[PDB]
A paper describes a structure:
A major biofilm matrix determinant of Pseudomonas aeruginosa is the partially deacetylated α-1,4 linked N-acetylgalactosamine polymer, Pel. PelA's deacetylase domain selectively removes acetyl groups from the polysaccharide, rendering Pel cationic, while its glycoside hydrolase (GH) family 166 (GH166) domain hydrolyzes Pel. The hydrolase activity is required for the generation of the cell-free form of the polysaccharide, which is important for the biomechanical properties of the biofilm and P. aeruginosa virulence.
Diffraction data were collected for selenomethionyl-incorporated (SeMet) PtPelA at the National Synchrotron Light Source-II to 2.1 Å, and the structure was solved using the single-wavelength anomalous diffraction method. Structural analysis of PtPelA reveals four distinct domains that align well with the AF2 model of PaPelA (PaPelAAF2; 1.6 Å RMSD over 816 α-carbons). Combined, this suggests that the β-rich domain could provide structural stability to PtPelA and facilitate carbohydrate binding. These results suggest that the domain organization in the full-length structure of PtPelA is unique with respect to experimentally solved structures. Using sequence analysis and enzymatic assays, we found that PtPelA and its homologs define a new class of carbohydrate esterases, CE21, with distant homology to the CE4 and CE18 families.
Numbering used by the authors: 27 to 82, 106 to 197, 199 to 320, 324 to 388, 396 to 416, 421 to 587, 615 to 702, 717 to 926
Write the structure that this text describes.
Amino acid sequence: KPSSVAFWYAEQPPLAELSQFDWVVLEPGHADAADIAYLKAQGSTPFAYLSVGEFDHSQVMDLSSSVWREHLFSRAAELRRQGYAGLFLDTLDSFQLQSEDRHEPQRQALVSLLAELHRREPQLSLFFNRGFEVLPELPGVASAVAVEIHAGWEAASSRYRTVSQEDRDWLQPHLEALRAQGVPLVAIEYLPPERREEARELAARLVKEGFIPYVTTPALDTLGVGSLEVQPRRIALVYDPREGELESNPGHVMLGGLLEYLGYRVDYWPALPQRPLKGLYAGVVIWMTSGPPSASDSFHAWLNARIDEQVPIAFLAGLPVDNDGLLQRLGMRRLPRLEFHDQSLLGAFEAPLRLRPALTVTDPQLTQAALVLEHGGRRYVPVATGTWGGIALAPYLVEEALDHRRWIIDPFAFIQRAFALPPLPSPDVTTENGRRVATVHIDGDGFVSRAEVPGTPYAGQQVLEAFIRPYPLLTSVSVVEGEVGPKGMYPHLSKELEPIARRIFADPKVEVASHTFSHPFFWDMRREVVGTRDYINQRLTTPEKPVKMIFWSGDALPDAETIKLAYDSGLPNVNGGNTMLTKAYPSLTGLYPLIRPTSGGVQYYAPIINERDVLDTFALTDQPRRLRGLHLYYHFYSGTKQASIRAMHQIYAEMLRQQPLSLWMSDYVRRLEGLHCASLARRADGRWQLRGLAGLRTLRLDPALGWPDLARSKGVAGVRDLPQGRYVHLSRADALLALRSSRDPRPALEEANLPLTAWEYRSASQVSFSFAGELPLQFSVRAAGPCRVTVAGQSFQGKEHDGLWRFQLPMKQVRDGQLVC
């Protein structure tokens, strides 16, 4: 029996958010096979809309007609074959539009139609929309019945209308009876997107009245409020393609990574979506500096639609608005000495405020200036916020110089203020089981180069002996077929080079990746993606250790079709961007995003760029905010010179001093997948519900939300309260996070060196747990009394240090260990 239900009849269903709901009704034809399978993998049950009484300007069909009956029976079979778990049966009372003479005939034809559909397809759950005239003769057939109770939509007048008490009285006996037969009742209510607080109240009311509510819009094209409410965890970033493609837009390059860090999926848009963003987007960033698009009327309409639904909008850098009425709605108008500024928003973050846009505030009730400059006696306002969002216009956004930029606004404070962002458990990929994450991946370039060392071995052997073998970090290694293979550019060296590659790929700390055939410096694509995959799999490694990833060469900006080709070939991908921060130039403007979404799929940028700059980037992305894990990225050419070799050894040493949790790049990318896809929802019992996390298992909990409540959580193992964040550790993707205002004194995981695969409280003092990785397990527990772990008939007493109980077990995996304190 369902605990929550959502309806989405539009294209581009937001899959992770909808998967928060037990049942999801879709419009088949606006959804594809991949959509259905994703919902199911997340635990949701997908239903398909099917109109029974009418054909779609509708045609009331003859329910006794053999052509129509068999059409619907056929459609049911197809939809089942396509993966739907049920049907949402609509227009079940449309027969009453006929003459009273034909009413009983058609009713009886409908009872038999539905009985026969049920008989033929017993595996399909049948979710009726009303049907009160036929349900009494279909006992046990309906899994649920919907009713469109308090807030309705009147299609004839195109308006939202309170439901008459007369209408409820008519419904009341029918619903009473259904409740007595144990049939779930789904109340489908309609409120405009801006009246979201009312929707929350109505949903709570309908639950107490015994319904499963879903409060939405008449087009069913919004993420509505149900018995749970999805937390808007996306931010949109709109750019002007005339000014450049996404990958060079300054908002993507300088802000995308900060929005990811703050806790959000970032969707990038150059036709803008013509549906409500309310309930799905926490805000919209606009970063356009050449004015409105040529289709300016539609653009202005779109902006006004967000204002009207109260989705906040932040205009950064430029103000692409040629519409005084729009500006008037925001209390602004088009029209140097410093008259005023809000130092919480600018001037105290990186760059100081230095004097160097014809825009002012007309209504301080609507817009609060953060910066007021006076020139020629007029007051200009280039930075401001209000309930509608904000503006932060050049040259008071970023200080710019050739090769260097610094923030003038505090970007975090501005976005938080403009969008009124609430505190979140933010998905976080920098830290796992309380430890900073470490990856090491190697581009194959220079494998064939000879090291400037005695013996002049190949760079491939040098990296194997100097770096891979001596250090205990899992490493993801690529080669270029154009270097090492018979069909490449060194066909007579392949006989000496392939054996080295085979030895590397056979090391137990190594996983295999491809670095293409010809190492394109600037992106035959099937030859580069598929052919070198096949070359490596066949000649350099075994069936049990295949290529796991493609590492892009060169500028690492393939097109959408190439990315899709890589996915179609079983190869997740990594590289690109230019995340680099140095003590010389430590501005956070140097942080790229992790994620580059395309129509061909997601490209993951290199978390930290390749080849002192790197040791600095590690430190500046660790503190005061931990923006990145320890991500060592280099080329085989780095093993050709004593000085590069010396530098490498110093990087490895700093990484190991931090005692990270080591991951292969292919496993790390499943964490980044969660970064991109995660959804958060707030249940009525107050717990946070998670979907779409994939391999991600850390939430950075905003201290305003308190501490994990380990009595009421599911899949939450502990917390580590560090300067950079309150890291909550998850033992599964479908976790439920209960919160309390004080730290839970029951035994909690503090840190561990291996991935965590289970953690369940048997009691306030006993935990069953499981870990699996590549090193002997080390972990520590925060608890009062002494702690002991029993595994496979053996007991280990915890060693105490400063409130923690530390454990070192001589095993790389633990299945259902027992912790008692």
